[PDB]
Amino acid sequence: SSKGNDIIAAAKRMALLMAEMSRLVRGGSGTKRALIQCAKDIAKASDEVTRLAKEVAKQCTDKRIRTNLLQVCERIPTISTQLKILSTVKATMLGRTNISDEESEQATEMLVHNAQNLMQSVKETVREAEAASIKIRTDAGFTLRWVRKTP
Amino acid sequence: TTALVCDNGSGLVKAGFAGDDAPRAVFPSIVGRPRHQGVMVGMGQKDSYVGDEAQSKRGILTLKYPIEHGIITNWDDMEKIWHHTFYNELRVAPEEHPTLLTEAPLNPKANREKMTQIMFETFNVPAMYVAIQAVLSLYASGRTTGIVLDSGDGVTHNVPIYEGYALPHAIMRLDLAGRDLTDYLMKILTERGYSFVTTAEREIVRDIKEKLCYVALDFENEMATAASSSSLEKSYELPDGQVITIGNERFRCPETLFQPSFIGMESAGIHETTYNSIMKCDIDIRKDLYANNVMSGGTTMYPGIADRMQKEITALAPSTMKIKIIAPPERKYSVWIGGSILASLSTFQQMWITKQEYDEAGPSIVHRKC
Amino acid sequence: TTALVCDNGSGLVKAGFAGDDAPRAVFPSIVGRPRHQGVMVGMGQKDSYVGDEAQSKRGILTLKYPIEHGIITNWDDMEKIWHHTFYNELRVAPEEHPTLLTEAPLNPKANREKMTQIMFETFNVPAMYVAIQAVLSLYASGRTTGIVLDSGDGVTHNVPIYEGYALPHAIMRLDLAGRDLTDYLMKILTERGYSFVTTAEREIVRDIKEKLCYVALDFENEMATAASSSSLEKSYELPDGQVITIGNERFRCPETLFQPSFIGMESAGIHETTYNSIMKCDIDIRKDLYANNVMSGGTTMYPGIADRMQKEITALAPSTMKIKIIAPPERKYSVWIGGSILASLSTFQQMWITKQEYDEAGPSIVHRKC
Amino acid sequence: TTALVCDNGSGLVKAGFAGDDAPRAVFPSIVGRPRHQGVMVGMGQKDSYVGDEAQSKRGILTLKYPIEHGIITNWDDMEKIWHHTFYNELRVAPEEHPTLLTEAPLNPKANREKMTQIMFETFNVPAMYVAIQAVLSLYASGRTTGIVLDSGDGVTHNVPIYEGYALPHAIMRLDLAGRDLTDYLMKILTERGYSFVTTAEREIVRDIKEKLCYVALDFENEMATAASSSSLEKSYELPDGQVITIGNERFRCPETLFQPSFIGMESAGIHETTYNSIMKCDIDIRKDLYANNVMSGGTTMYPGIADRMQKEITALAPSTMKIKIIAPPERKYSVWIGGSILASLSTFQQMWITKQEYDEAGPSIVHRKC
Ligand SMILES: Nc1ncnc2c1ncn2[C@@H]1O[C@H](COP(=O)(O)OP(=O)(O)O)[C@@H](O)[C@H]1O
Ligand SMILES: Nc1ncnc2c1ncn2[C@@H]1O[C@H](COP(=O)(O)OP(=O)(O)O)[C@@H](O)[C@H]1O
Ligand SMILES: Nc1ncnc2c1ncn2[C@@H]1O[C@H](COP(=O)(O)OP(=O)(O)O)[C@@H](O)[C@H]1O
Ligand SMILES: [Mg+2]
Ligand SMILES: [Mg+2]
Ligand SMILES: [Mg+2]
């Protein structure tokens, strides 16, 4: 029951890095180099969730939970890889001279939406892992026995 | 611990805890599976979607209801819905909670025995009980006497109850409900040029049915009004941005409840099925049944359904009787609300079917107790 | 070892390694052979030039493309380009690297089968995989949902993808791209007295196309504007030293993407091909396709192509949806960038076609996996 | 005077006189308009071609069908076809002949009100009547009982009729027919390297479909036979002089009737649509519908369609019923032949909609009679 509540704190570190990234999109062109660095560690913090949500799947004995958890958690190795590579492409395109005010305006939305898609994919594997903790808890004892009330 | 009240309808699952005033989880009773090609690696690996996620991703799925007309037809897809409403929706373990299930009357007996075996041998509940849906609608009305009309997604049934005594020879059942009105509205929407053929486009016509349809007080006056005027027209916007306009199919769709010949059935309408259920009862209890006509279920939620039921039963009743139709605003959850009352009674805890009672009698114990 | 990504387009070869942000080697996909008399001893004895060697000595060569319309037509010339991009451009050995290749949809099956036989029995790669170019353009945009317009040098195709599922009945393909615009610009430059006939002078008109051509927002306004003034005129200096002056052919050359009847084709424009491919999809996913119109490939690099695409699809859309065209500045390499994302995925390493699997099934194994 | 029978199909017009055994005029239901430049004075000034002269000059024309899916979409072009089949094909005046027209079931009601107005106010016929196409296919079979399967160029519909009574709740309709198989064959011909994109090239693939295609009795055996052997190959000579060779696409094109997933549809095949239409009928008439399975229309003319329909319905039927499919050799004209039977009846002569009845009630009289 110790690696079951590890997932919530791991997925809450990503909620702080997303809210940090949502503040940097209000500023001008000076804060966009810190936006790319704020996107290259969301993709690393998401790698911690898929590292230990696999460990919960090795613990759960219910096959309808352990296979529904691995089917939803495999999106996180995909959207994280295309977030740390798309951030590398946008880190090179700022090296040009006089791009626009609008060209770099839409270039951040390709990193925000790619990170909102990663955050929406990692909250849907916490749900199927919180449902795994109900099966792990009862198979290791911890079960409230029901007794019928006497008239 | 707390008893669970699960109301497995043909169209919606209403689940929650015993004692509350509203169900906690209300989601569609569908299972969707993908029908297209998963070309992107990693994303397309989920095999089936169950609850509201089959309704939001419905553009790429094939939607299936496991319950047709009250009878569970797909037993593997039904366990997916029951596993979804325990772990993912209520987030409780089923080993620590007794579960109250419901059923319609005049169902097969293998339907009630297999859902007893699934509850005891797959989810391992401590106790269970199956109830009748029209009995529970009387608990949710402040009454012990009255004839219930319960119309949901697959079944329409009448049950007369007098002082806690049901008259099972006068119980009616008609397999015509909200799923058959959705299919009829799809057929008469082709007269304007709109074609909804997909199972995902069936969930769109069900949303047009729930917003634009009503019950006409006089059917032949409204059919002549809609031909002379254009004030009966309304507009609905599709998910892609197109706008459709229906004017005549708003009241012609729920007239199938009062004229079931519109879909090729020979049965009588729900106003005549109710009156025939009263006249099968004893003459001394008929006066207290005319004054208590409890409407329940989701298909009884059209505008004008209760003023049309009062007009048609008064024309059959002997004209010195007092007809009164009880239609509360919480009609859609009457089977759940009265099911939480029954599971909360202190008398009821001797009436559960415990798991050690199940071991000597098998699944046949549900017929001798429920 | 590191996987190789090779994007054999009709006009350019984009090669590199899996994981980087840009292709390492970008060179024209031509093979030139001499057409004159080698009178000096020792020097004129090379028989074929491949990369920028043929683009530099093009005045004495006959340039030919081994790929037209996305289909490899010369197989002895395509082995020269693959041998040049391995040993001379990337400077690697093909036996130590799995190679990712791309292909357009609705292509002949003999084209994909022969490129696995060349890769396995001439260059001896350990593994390979053939991907669809418009699926890889969706990886390079951070999306899993949207309709891609890939337009390169031979093929213009549309692919709708929703949540990682492609809808292959809604996939379009039009054989009109940047080589058919170069040939049309060569034809309408005869109205001013400029004659470009050889294959070396075709590479000069491709530079005029890449520098002076744009897409008008309304074609009938600027066709009267350019006749009223001389403000749309521009000048270009030829390699000889002469100066040409084009004023009307700047927006008339890329107009044939939107009016393909300028070159004698019955097909619809790229705005109607995008709208007809959205309307072949299911009605619930159409809203998320209108809002994600990914543009890809080098022919979509005209000034004004994305504002003309937004005007024309909005005139066909149902006026409640919002249209949005995603056109990043790295459009020319989005098939490569998404190809390096796919070959870097840990899920992808069970999807290679290994050489052990090829020896049991022959070249027909590429249809079952890719 | 003699009545006229006009069967406006989606692809072909079948016109003639009531009483005969075959239609007099059978021509394609197209309208062609030129797309090129008329450089010679006097010759190229005809602006529209209609019948067989649009099929012969199709190399310089853009061909348009005014009817898709059974619904008339172009009303200016549909009057050109009706004016062609009266004055130029039948060579009669429309004022001296009552005209029998046909329509598919579940069609829009504005389609039948407008074609009543065109007949009464543009061609000035004395009387008219619109009949259901699958009812007329039962007249032309010598029966009064049986379920019809009519499959033409846009619509595939099922109609059960028992002793002259139709069961309209069991009438099916599927928008998949011979034009949706021409488009699918064009898509799977790209796998062999053949590209037909023009609307005039669509008429060439329709001749390949009508000559080389057949229905496999077991689809998975023929897909393995064609990969091991080469005896399923056949050759076709194009109008240019080239020769194409298809071996696998001969049975994969008509399999879309039995697996509509091949073009991205969720519907069931024509064998499951027929069985579901029988089971919607009453149990006492189901035995007389299994033994009378009338096939009609041009899409039912593949070699092996009737031996495949017998195998698939027998696998769904309860195994003590006998299945018999009635497929006469004159299947392509059975809607016309039964239309000449009905218009020749002395009982029918009081069922015309006369022109004086049209002036009193307007175009809504066509629904109160037909
Ligand atoms: N406002 C409404 N008007 C008409 N029909 C409605 C309305 N709301 C729900 N329905 C119909 O009610 C049915 C489901 O009601 P419910 O009694 O919950 O079903 P079940 O008992 O089968 O779970 C559906 O067919 C739905 O279309
Ligand atoms: N700035 C530009 N404007 C217009 N056309 C361009 C531009 N840059 C490249 N092109 C055209 O793009 C084509 C090659 O684009 P690309 O997609 O890289 O090729 P491929 O056909 O190999 O996919 C050539 O026909 C070239 O003329
Ligand atoms: N021998 C054949 N085999 C297969 N398809 C055929 C054959 N003959 C005609 N067809 C198809 O039949 C269709 C027209 O059939 P028909 O019922 O006469 O047309 P409609 O009912 O639309 O007027 C065309 O799509 C044509 O391709
Ligand atoms: Mg219910
Ligand atoms: Mg390309
Ligand atoms: Mg026909």
Author numbering:
A (entry chain M): 981 to 1131
B (entry chain C), C (entry chain E), D (entry chain D): 5 to 374
Text of the article:
Our studies focus on the homologous adhesion proteins α-catenin and vinculin, which are major ABP components found in adherens junctions (α-catenin and vinculin) and focal adhesions (vinculin) that are critical for the force-dependent strengthening of cellular adhesion and mechanotransduction. Approximately 3 Å resolution cryo-EM structures of both proteins bound to F-actin (to our knowledge, the highest-resolution structures of ABP-F-actin complexes reported to date) reveal they share an overlapping major actin-binding site. Next, we compared the metavinculin ABD-F-actin and α-catenin ABD-F-actin structures, confirming previous low- and moderate-resolution studies that both ABDs engage a major site spanning the longitudinal interface of 2 actin protomers, which we term Actin I and Actin II (numbered from the plus end of the filament).
